[PDB]
Each structure stands twice: as structure tokens, then as C-alpha cells.
Design an enzyme around this catalytic site. Sequence first.
Site, short mmCIF file in Angstrom:
data_model
loop_
_atom_site.label_atom_id
_atom_site.label_comp_id
_atom_site.label_asym_id
_atom_site.label_seq_id
_atom_site.Cartn_x
_atom_site.Cartn_y
_atom_site.Cartn_z
N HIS A 136 -33.07 -39.78 -4.47
CA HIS A 136 -33.83 -38.74 -3.91
C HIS A 136 -35.36 -38.89 -3.49
O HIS A 136 -35.59 -38.66 -2.45
CB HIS A 136 -33.41 -37.60 -5.17
CG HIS A 136 -34.48 -36.33 -4.65
ND1 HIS A 136 -34.08 -35.53 -3.79
CD2 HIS A 136 -35.60 -35.68 -5.33
CE1 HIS A 136 -35.08 -34.53 -3.60
NE2 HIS A 136 -35.82 -34.53 -4.70
N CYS A 194 -33.18 -29.55 -1.30
CA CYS A 194 -33.25 -30.57 -1.15
C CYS A 194 -31.87 -31.37 -1.24
O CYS A 194 -31.57 -32.60 -0.92
CB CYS A 194 -34.05 -31.83 -1.91
SG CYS A 194 -35.45 -30.62 -2.35
N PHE A 199 -35.19 -28.12 -5.20
CA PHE A 199 -35.75 -26.86 -5.84
C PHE A 199 -34.62 -25.89 -6.38
O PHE A 199 -33.98 -25.53 -5.72
CB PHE A 199 -36.46 -26.39 -4.55
CG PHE A 199 -37.91 -26.70 -4.53
CD1 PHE A 199 -38.44 -27.94 -4.97
CD2 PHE A 199 -39.04 -25.85 -4.00
CE1 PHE A 199 -39.72 -28.43 -4.96
CE2 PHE A 199 -40.27 -26.28 -3.83
CZ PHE A 199 -40.49 -27.59 -4.17
N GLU A 237 -36.27 -39.41 -12.01
CA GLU A 237 -35.15 -40.01 -11.44
C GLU A 237 -34.85 -41.35 -11.88
O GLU A 237 -34.00 -41.99 -12.06
CB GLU A 237 -35.09 -39.95 -9.95
CG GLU A 237 -33.70 -40.36 -9.31
CD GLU A 237 -33.79 -40.32 -7.87
OE1 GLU A 237 -34.95 -39.96 -7.26
OE2 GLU A 237 -32.88 -40.34 -7.34
N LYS A 288 -36.71 -41.93 2.44
CA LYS A 288 -37.98 -41.10 2.66
C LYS A 288 -39.32 -41.53 2.78
O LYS A 288 -40.17 -40.93 3.43
CB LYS A 288 -38.10 -39.63 1.50
CG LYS A 288 -36.61 -39.10 1.61
CD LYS A 288 -36.86 -37.84 0.45
CE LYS A 288 -35.60 -36.93 0.32
NZ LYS A 288 -34.50 -37.67 -0.06
N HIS A 303 -39.16 -36.47 4.22
CA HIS A 303 -38.30 -35.31 3.52
C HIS A 303 -37.73 -34.39 4.36
O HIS A 303 -38.53 -33.46 5.01
CB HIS A 303 -39.01 -34.86 2.10
CG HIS A 303 -38.09 -33.90 1.52
ND1 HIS A 303 -36.65 -33.92 1.76
CD2 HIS A 303 -38.15 -33.39 0.40
CE1 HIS A 303 -36.14 -33.21 0.70
NE2 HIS A 303 -37.05 -32.79 -0.20
#
Lengths: 420, 420
Positions: B311, B170, B406, B321, B342, B347
Amino acid sequence: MRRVVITGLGLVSPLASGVEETWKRLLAGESGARRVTEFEVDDLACQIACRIPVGDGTNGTFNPDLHMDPKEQRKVDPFIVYAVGAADQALDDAGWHPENDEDQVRTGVLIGSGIGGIEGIVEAGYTLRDKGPRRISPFFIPGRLINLASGHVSIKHKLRGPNHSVVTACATGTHAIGDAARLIAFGDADVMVAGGTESPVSRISLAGFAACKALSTERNDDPTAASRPYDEDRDGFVMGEGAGIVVLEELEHALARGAKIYAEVIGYGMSGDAFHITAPTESGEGAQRCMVAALKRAGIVPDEIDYINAHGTSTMADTIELGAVERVVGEAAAKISMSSTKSSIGHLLGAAGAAEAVFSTLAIRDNIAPATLNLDNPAAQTRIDLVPHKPRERKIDVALSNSFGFGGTNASLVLRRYTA
Amino acid sequence: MRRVVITGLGLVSPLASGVEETWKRLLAGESGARRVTEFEVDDLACQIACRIPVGDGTNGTFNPDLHMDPKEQRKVDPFIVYAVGAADQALDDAGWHPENDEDQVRTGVLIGSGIGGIEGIVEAGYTLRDKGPRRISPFFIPGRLINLASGHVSIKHKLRGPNHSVVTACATGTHAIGDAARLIAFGDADVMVAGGTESPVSRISLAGFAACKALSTERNDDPTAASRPYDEDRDGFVMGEGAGIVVLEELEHALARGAKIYAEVIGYGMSGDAFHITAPTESGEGAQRCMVAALKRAGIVPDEIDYINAHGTSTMADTIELGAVERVVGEAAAKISMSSTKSSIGHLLGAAGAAEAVFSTLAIRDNIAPATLNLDNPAAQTRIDLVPHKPRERKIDVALSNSFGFGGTNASLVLRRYTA
């Protein structure tokens, strides 16, 4: 801009697990090439590969259990296991195991791979088609992502600095090291675990590389003779597997703790051929510009080069690289030694640059240029010493390592003895 | 160190092919999410995705034939096609098409992807088992390598500078832009084509991400409502596909040739969680350090941040976050707008950071913060303006874009209006 030195080495290779054991076997002229026996190859054009010797951990064998529990090994493709093995070795060698907050947050990891989990992707593809989506392992995705080599190493060793990963085919390991050194030079980290890992010895990979005519096919019954960089009878590369890792460290950081220093990273260059998806440019102009940029970064001239660790994959392109190197080094050619250690351990793809950086570092430490095995009848006449058959003991203070990958991606590293 | 500005944008997104057309639809509150119809999904936990509208190239549709011959498209996985299209757009927008030697050798490319050609690898795996190794395409390897997006873009446009590629899940698109900006700052290139591309909407990918419980599963019959970052009822991310590209350029080079300047790249930060292969840290501490590092590089305090492109994938992590951002910005929280795009386009994995850097650039240009769609009931009470439902016009001079991938890989970028 801070100075960056190498303070740890790690290597899982087709000759041995372990840096000194690989190096001893390399210099002794041993080859990692053999018939692939772990899966079906009778119907493949190329039936050989350079494979890591697996065992209990003694006699230079690789015991993955020493680095990852077997239950954890089953959740990942082999490239991750090789990276953890080599990283473990390198951190041990560096005496670096971050325990306090400052040491953890100032140490990162940047480990690349060229193809990553191709093998496990194909296996999951079969499970998907044969057994259905509910049989896909929850570990399918993370165990096949290239950046999870960095991930596993970070988690295991509490490395909380920059966590990064690159993918540039045959250039991967060289970019990984250059990029990690820049992270330190620019102040983003004080220590980096850096390099490359690959597990490309699988049915799909051997079939795929044979399909684009990249691999040796004429020496399946004499595998140790197959990889023969610069030789008239070369016929393609021999795939290898494993991981190379260096611990890079800011110079003052290293001196303040008294860390042993193998060598200094002084130059890094990059370029693009912009020519063809797999074919090297006929003129070698991209490789030439890459080397020139690395030497300019290093602030050195060809008169100062001692050893070159070639890309030298045992393909028709070996001579283009040789030509580009000759143009770069001019009159210095006769006093430079240039060899391809792919003659011994084959082409580790994304790990090649990292293994070859380790070898280039040891060449400086030990004042010895590794051989180009199998160089019975050189294809071209050159003043460069190609170190045929047996290593040459000689002064080596400066090493240049080249990697020129699919897609036209070129990277070079310049290493130098640390004096002050 | 030289300054680096953004002089061209390109975007192939689930809303549209085209920067302005994507931006218009984004600000209008359109969603790219729909039930997947191109392959079988009814046996999957997640049956929805955000897909590029394909067509003849009019009405914001994507026409791959405008970017690559049909015979060439079938030799690669879609992520390469999407990258070429976005790069075509960005170079046209920048008015940069290197024709002389210098312009070619001083322009490089750095395009990343998180997963690359997983789909075509599965297909070749079937060909291997069903038809045999002789029926494997010569194009199997090059068409599936992550770095061949950079390769094709370099070949098409004769870009002979650094040819590079990164892979950080990501975080990929953000690292790619940060690293390309460093290549310019440090003098390795004067122009870089940079960004991220992903083609992760396939059966294997959807099955894999559902297996690790990453995807939304409870809103297959209401796809546009499924991606709901920060909302109480979020249940995982919605996969999207596409590519984002920026043309980055050294400042004096841009100014001398009369280039348009969208904004300046002023900060870049990285960190690692060192926690878990897929799960976020409970503390958000790695995210915090990454943002703090980015702001330090940029030389700004949090009071100077106007807009944050989060994110924000619509997962449990969203609130972690949010907590990390609150701790970073302190009393500036009441002034700052933070939204996740997103919510609109899902995503894009390795392309997410690149698309979101393009959106952060346009947020500056147009003084408008994109909405977080579907934010009916925020999961936490915060002073931060999460821009629910509809965009908000406001002063935006500094944008922060976060990506937390990830493996615990974190990257942040800071962009600022260009004044002088």
C-alpha cells in the site's frame, strides 16, 4: 457454501425511525411525501420529497442525537448519520454486539450509497471559492466518502471483519445485501451488517434529477398522490431519504446462539442492460435475465414466488418492468402479488433496495403484501395482483426484490421463510 | 468453484497511456510527479501531483478522442474517460469483443472509484448558484455517478453480464478485482472487465486532502522526490490520476479460445480496522488479518510469496504496514521483495489497487520487482528487500498486493504464475 439468514432489521425511513413503526405506518397507507421546506424550492421543477420525520425520538421520530453526538453529526453528510441509526437498530434487534476477539473479527459491514455526500461537496465548493482553501474542514473528505458509512458503523461497533461498500445507483441496496450474503456463504465472515443509505434531498440533487427529467413535477401541491407506480398519470419519481440495514448471519452461527430468524437469503442475480446511461432498455431483457439468474441461484421456479417488491419508481419504465416480470413468471402471474413501496416512501436511490429488502422480509414474517398507493387507473392490463391502495393479507413464503439502476445496473434478491 | 485468470491488461497512468509503455517507464525509474499547472495551486499546502501525459496518442500520450467522441467527453467527469480508455486497451489485449448473445450476457464489468465526480459536482454547484437550476445540464447526474464508469464501458462494448461498482477509498481497485474474480468463480459470469478509476487531481480534491493533512507539503519545489515510501523524510502522499483494468476470465473459457494468460487470481482477503476515520491502527492488526485471510484463500504459506506490492503511500503508516508484513511472513522476510510503486506514480486512490494489480501481474511475467524510488534512508531496519532506487530482477511466481484505505477498509489480492 454456507446458508445465510436475516437476524436483525433496522430502518430510518420517510415514515418513521424504527422498523415496526415504519411497517405499521406503511400498512396503514401513510405517505412520506411532502413539500420540501428545509431549503429553497420555489424555482425547482420538483418541490416535493419523502422526508424522515425528525424529533426527540418518540412517536416514530428520528433523533440523530441518540446515535451520534451533535458535534460528530456536523462532521458528516446525513447519509452517514442515517446508516449509524439503522445499524444501531439492526444490531440491537439481532442481540449482536461483538465483545470478544472472535466475534469482532468475524463480523463485518457492507453499506452502500448511490450518490453519497453530493450536498456537502457543493457546500465545500462554495467555501473553497468564497473563503478559500484554509477554510476547508479537515473533515470534508472523510465525511463525504461513500465507504465512511461502513467506516463509522465498524468503528462504533468494533466490527473488524470485511469492511466494504458498493455504489450502483438505484440497485445499491440490493447489491449490498447480495454481496454481504456471499461474504458469509464463502466463509469471509460469519455476521454482516449490510444495506444502503442515502441523503439525496438537497437543492443540487433535486435540480440535477429534474434536469434529466427523472422526477415528478405535476403534483407539487398534492405530494402524497405524486408517486403512483403503474398508474396512467405517473410522471416521474419522488426522491426519498434514509437507510435500510439487515444483520445477515451464517445459519449454524444463528442456530447455535438461538438468534431469531426472519428469513433466509436464497438467491441473488445481477445483469447489465448495456443500452443507455439513464434510459431502461425498451424490451426489459436485462431485467428479465437478472430475475432469471436470481431464481436459478435460489433453485426455485415461478410457481414458488408469492410476493415481488418491484423497482417500480413511478416512471414510464414501470410498464417495461411489469412486462419483464410477466415473461419471467408465465402462468404463475395470477397468483403473485407485486407492489411498489416507492408509492409510500418514494425512491431512496442507493437505500431503496435495502429498505425494500426489509419490507420484503416483513411481508414474509407477517404474511401481508404492502400496497401500491395511488393506483387509480392502471396503465396496463395484467393478471399480476398489483395490490392497489391497501395491503393484502396472503400466504407469503418467497419474496423477490428487484432494483434496476442508472447505467443499466440490475440486481435481484430472493428471500424465503426459514423452516429447516 | 472455477479458476480465474488474467487475460488482458489496460492502464492509463501518470507515466503513460498504455500498459507496456507505463511498465517500461516505471522500470526505468521515471516519476510522474510535477507541479500542477492546470488550475490554481499556489494557495494550497500541496502543489504537486502525478498526472497523465495528454496528447495525440503517440509517444505514450493519452488521447481521449481515441476512446470517446469529444462531445461525449464533455458530458462526464474524467474518471469515466480514463476507465473507457483502460477498458478499451484491456479488451484489445485480451482479444475479447463480444458479438453474439452468449458472449455478451456472460461478460460483465466491475469498475470502482473512491471519489468519482467531486470536481464536476463542485462545478454544477457553481452553475446552480450563479446561473440557476434551469442551467443545470441533463448530464450532471449520470456524468458524476461512480457506477457510470461501468455503465459507459458496458454500453460501448455490449457487456450484458453483471454490471457492478465498488467504492472503498484506497482499497477500491483491489476489492473490484477480488469481487469480479468471485463473480467468475461462482458462475455469475465467464469474463469480467474489472478495475479502478480516479480523477482526483482538482482544486477541490487537493484542498480537501491537504485539509486532513494527507498530502506531501515539504517538496513542492522538488516534485519527483516527494513520494518516498518508507523513507525517514516522508511527509504524506502525492495524488495521482488514471485507471487500471484487467480482463478476468474463467480458466477453461480462456483455454478453449486460445486466450493469452498472464497469471491466475488465487487469493483475496478483506478486513476492517474499526479504529479511526482516517488514521491507521498503531498495531497494524487489521492489515495483518487481511493478508493472512488472502493467503489462506490462496492456499499458500508466506515462504511462497516472492513479491509484495505495498500500500506504501509515503505517510506515517508506511512503517505500520511494514511491521504487519514482517509479522505475517516470519522467517521468509529475508527472501521477499516489497516495493511501493506509489513512489513513481503517486497515489491513484480508487485506481491504485487496479494499477498495482497490473504491476504485480507484470512483475510475475517479467520476473522483476519495481523499485521504491527515493528510499534514501529507511525509517526502520528490516530484513525485507524494499528494492530501493532501482528495480531488481528475481524469480517472481507469487505476488501479494495490499490496499489499506480511509475508513479502515482493507483488501489484499494474491496472484500466481499460471502453470496448469
